[PDB]
Amino acid sequence: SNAASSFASVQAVVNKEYGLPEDYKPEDLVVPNVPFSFSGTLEKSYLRKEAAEALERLFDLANKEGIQLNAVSGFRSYDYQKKLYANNVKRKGSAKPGHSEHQTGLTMDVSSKSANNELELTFANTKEGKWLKENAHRAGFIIRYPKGKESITGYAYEPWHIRYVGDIAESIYKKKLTLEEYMNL
Ligand SMILES: [Cl-]
Ligand SMILES: [Cl-]
Ligand SMILES: [Cl-]
Ligand SMILES: [Cl-]
């Protein structure tokens, strides 16, 4: 009971405990037509079609209120996550392969120029970070790892990390719940 159930669902919970199939790669990956903090088309330029279109919509919403967001890193394959994890562990003198939500193709790191497009806490103090915190849900996204929820999500606050879950994001935001709690996983 270490394997994520309904692994391909928009509401799947992938975390320290629940892992995805090592051979799971979404079959509907596309590049969302949004600005990116990096050039070219790499594996991280993709999101599942539905999450891609939602992200485009979130960015249009942001632009209407003068908020300019940049996409930093989306989909990451099992293969990639393995190397990243191994090379990150030996740097002692990051999620385990399969246990990163990025492999679902529903997750995206976002930042802004006001934060040097970096994925750091300071992004929370920017007008863009704050807008994202309170507006992510309007497009189907949630801040996957909120402030004092590390006990439940297993990760410290990540203001830059959004997860597409669809219509339930509205309720998750209002009720101040984590995806774990909302899905009883
Ligand atoms: Cl691909
Ligand atoms: Cl949220
Ligand atoms: Cl919190
Ligand atoms: Cl925290």
Residue numbers in the entry: -2 to 0, 55 to 144, 152 to 243
What do the authors report?
We report biochemical properties and crystal structures of the LD-carboxypeptidases LdcB from Streptococcus pneumoniae, Bacillus anthracis, and Bacillus subtilis. The enzymes are active against bacterial cell wall tetrapeptides and adopt a zinc-carboxypeptidase fold characteristic of the LAS superfamily. The LdcB enzymes are single domain proteins comprising two subdomains separated by a V-shaped cleft.
A further BaLdcB structure has been solved that contains no bound zinc ion, but there are negligible differences between it and its counterpart with zinc bound. The active site of the LdcB enzymes is, therefore, sculpted in a robust fashion, competent for peptidolysis once the catalytic machinery is completed by the incorporation of zinc. Though the BaLdcB structure contains the same subdomain, it is less well structured in this region than BsLdcB and SpLdcB, and, as a consequence, the β1–β3 sheet is not formed.
